Amino acid sequence: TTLGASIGSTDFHYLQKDYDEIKKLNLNTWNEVAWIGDELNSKIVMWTNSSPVNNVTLSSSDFINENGDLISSNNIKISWLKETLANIGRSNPSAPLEPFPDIIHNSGSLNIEKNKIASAWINIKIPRNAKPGIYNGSIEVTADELEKSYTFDYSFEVLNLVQPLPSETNTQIEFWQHPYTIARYYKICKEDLFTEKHFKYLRGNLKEYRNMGGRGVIATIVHEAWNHQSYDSDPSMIKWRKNSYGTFEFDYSHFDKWIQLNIDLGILDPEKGFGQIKCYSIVPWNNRIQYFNEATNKEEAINPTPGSDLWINIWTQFLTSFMSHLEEKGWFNITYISMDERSMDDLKACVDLIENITNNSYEHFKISSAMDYESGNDYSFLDRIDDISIGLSHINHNSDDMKNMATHRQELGLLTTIYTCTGDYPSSFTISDPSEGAFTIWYSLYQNTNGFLRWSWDGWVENPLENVSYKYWEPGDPFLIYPAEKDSIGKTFYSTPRLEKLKEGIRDINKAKYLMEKAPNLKNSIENLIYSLKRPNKGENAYGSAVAASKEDRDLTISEANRIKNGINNFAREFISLTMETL
Ligand SMILES: CC(=O)N[C@@H]1[C@@H](O)[C@@H](O)[C@@H](CO)O[C@H]1O
Ligand SMILES: CC(=O)N[C@@H]1[C@@H](O)[C@@H](O)[C@@H](CO)O[C@H]1O
Missing domain, CATH: 2.60.40.10 (Immunoglobulins)
Known part of the structure; x- marks a missing residue:
């Protein structure tokens, strides 16, 4: 027909x-x-x-x-x-x-x-x-x-x-935003960055983020901190310069407008300590710091080794100046200095330096990092980092190590997430089954973490509405939303089934947590349901993309997410019914 x-x-x-x-x-x-x-x-x-x-x-x-x-x-x-x-x-x-x-x-x-x-x-x-x-x-x-x-x-x-409101939950969600990418795509010239004309193309997608539970806001603190891995350069929100006296000065203009926007949108609340400012990074790519040298009137760059006298010198100047600036704004308590998966000698030098620099209430900067943790119960260095995110491919499923690590952090009131990226399965690619997203969120709860981090809110290529292909990674890896059409009046982004499935997982773990709290008779039953989660095996397609290891593994991903959900709704039901019969 x-x-x-x-x-x-x-x-x-x-x-x-x-x-x-x-x-x-x-x-x-x-x-x-x-x-x-x-x-x-x-x-x-x-x-x-x-x-x-x-x-x-x-x-x-x-x-x-x-x-x-x-x-x-x-x-x-x-x-x-x-x-x-x-x-x-x-x-x-x-x-x-x-x-x-x-x-x-x-x-x-x-x-x-x-x-x-x-x-x-x-x-x-x-x-x-x-x-x-x-x-x-x-x-x-x-x-x-x-x-x-x-x-x-x-x-x-x-x-x-x-259904709980996001602010009534303890779920941690962090997706990295790229506001200069939104400027590029929508033809916002240099002069209009972080003006109302830029904000009109940001607000919609940030509310979207907020309403599903986003709490982390990333901000870059040096130039090109990821060595241009993405289609668009990553500009620093803090411009660095070296003066005639040979010491550094910092322009926070873009940083301040960016954070204020996120405060205005209700994502960050510095007075009550809600949300986080993640400052990327004290270990940017190859430790390279690019800066304007006033004495020579040109751009220069240096690559000091972490823990050297020169590194310690420069980064003390940055951190003391940054801390003052933040204290003036009232933003310091929600600010974290981000490291990354680097040499453990470099990370030790970062943590040593950071702990040395205190404000007049005796507080040092909070610290955030992606961390390569796989086993062992030595938590002595991890306990020094306030928020860590562990990649799915580093988590050994047939093992309680991750869960043990995360439970320790939960007891200390520290934050823990899992993340996915290129090479992961399940994941949140264009080619992925969207239900991989709900599985991903359930898995963050299986591991007793606070939730989920991804580097990829909006890292658009040239014209993703028509071709998402990029020189690196599985397709759609760098962005979970699409832009709207360049000439759009009205819409500023479009959602994706993959994003809607993350949203689904987030709502459904929030149900599980709500019930565990409000139904002490069911909490252990609920925990056991979640502990029954199976994890599928992964392989690759012929072109280097991570995919399920078999049709059975692919069906597992879908059948597991839905099984936990349906089990949680049955607990919800038995709870309601027993409260009524017994009222
Ligand atoms: C509304 C909001 O963001 N609340 C958070 C809460 O969920 C929890 O993560 C806690 C960490 O100690 O910080 C709170 O202020
Ligand atoms: C925490 C995190 O996402 N780190 C990297 C990210 O910077 C990017 O390179 C991504 C590409 O998929 O791979 C991730 O491993």
């Missing part, structure tokens, strides 16, 4: 190459369980045969429970998934380019060419004052060349528990 349609999973992509199998789909009903103030996602997958089909549109009804309580269609947004091209390899110019439905794009009508797949993402926001019950409604697909519209029957159960 002209247009086929079926409900599909949000957990994996429906790709053009799978057209003939996709056409056999025939799911006409959907159901899910939600808390008050939760969100659900779904998907409709469609296909054409030999004719193009025009003006394809989806509309939701209102949803109504058994008492007539209403959740308006206002709370349902239906968005076309847009495809972009991705080189399917890693550092491999000859890998093929294939299309991936990675972009949650716009609402409205689509014209679909012949012999194509197209899917639409469905987002359902449950109001924070919604009534419990089973809600029913429908989603209707029409098109010009379609005689009989499709009606898909949707229901969900709202449980009588309230």
Whole structure:
């Protein structure tokens, strides 16, 4: 027929190459369980045969429970998934380019060419004052060349528990933002950086970050701190210069505007100690510091070795000046100096220096680092670092070491996350199954950490809406949101199924934590459910990208995330029911 349609999973992509199998789909009903103030996602997958089909549109009804309580269609947004091209390899110019439905794009009508797949993402926001019950409604697909519209029957159960607000949880989330990348893409000239004209293209995506639980805000403190690994250079938010007396001076202009923005948006709250400023880095690439030398009127650069007299000298100047500046602003207590996975001799020199430099309340800078930890219960150096993030590929699954390490840090009130990056599986690539994201968040809880860190909020390539390929890494690795179109009026970014799955994991671990606290009879049962989590094996495709080790491993990833979720909602249910029977 002209247009086929079926409900599909949000957990994996429906790709053009799978057209003939996709056409056999025939799911006409959907159901899910939600808390008050939760969100659900779904998907409709469609296909054409030999004719193009025009003006394809989806509309939701209102949803109504058994008492007539209403959740308006206002709370349902239906968005076309847009495809972009991705080189399917890693550092491999000859890998093929294939299309991936990675972009949650716009609402409205689509014209679909012949012999194509197209899917639409469905987002359902449950109001924070919604009534419990089973809600029913429908989603209707029409098109010009379609005689009989499709009606898909949707229901969900709202449980009588309230989804926690981010600020009511102890989940740590940190995604690295690249505000000069947003400037580049949207044609913000040098003169307008960190002016209102730049802020208009930042605010939307930062609120997005905030609302899902983002707490870490990165800021660069030297020039090109990652040696231009990304498509866009990384400028320093603190400009360095050397004066005629041979000592250094620091312009905090961009730094201050950046942090203030994040304070204004409610991401950081320095007075109450909410959120973090992560200052990258005291061990930037090759220890290289580029600075304007006033005596010679040109740019110079030096590479002092950590723990040398010269390194100690320069970095004492920076840290004492920075600490004063921060104290004047009232920002010091939420500021962390970031290291990185360097020689342990270099990290020791960093921690030694930092602990030497105190303010007049006897406090030194907090310290943050990605750390290569795999075993052993010697926590003597790790305990000196306030926030650490351990990469997934360094975590040995058949072992309690990570969990033991993290539990120690939890007892000391220190922070711990896991991160993913290039080479990881599960991960958060364009080519990934989006459900890898929910698995990733569950795994952060399995390891008894506070949550999840990723380097990659927005590190866009030239035109990611059309091709995400970059010279390094699996495709889509550097960004979890897309920009909007360069000429956009209105939208400033687009979400991704992979991001929405992280969001899902974050909401569902927050449920598990809420119940563990409010239901002491169930806490240990809940812990055991989480401890049953299995971790899949990984391999590589032919082009160097990390992928599941087998179909069984790939199915595990999806079946595990959903199993824990459903188990948590059953605990939620038994808890509600027993509270009622026993009230
Ligand atoms: C609202 C907010 O950000 N709260 C955090 C809390 O969740 C926890 O992480 C704690 C660390 O000791 O700091 C708090 O101020
Ligand atoms: C904490 C972290 O993400 N570190 C690096 C990051 O800088 C970047 O190189 C990324 C590329 O995927 O790999 C990560 O290992």
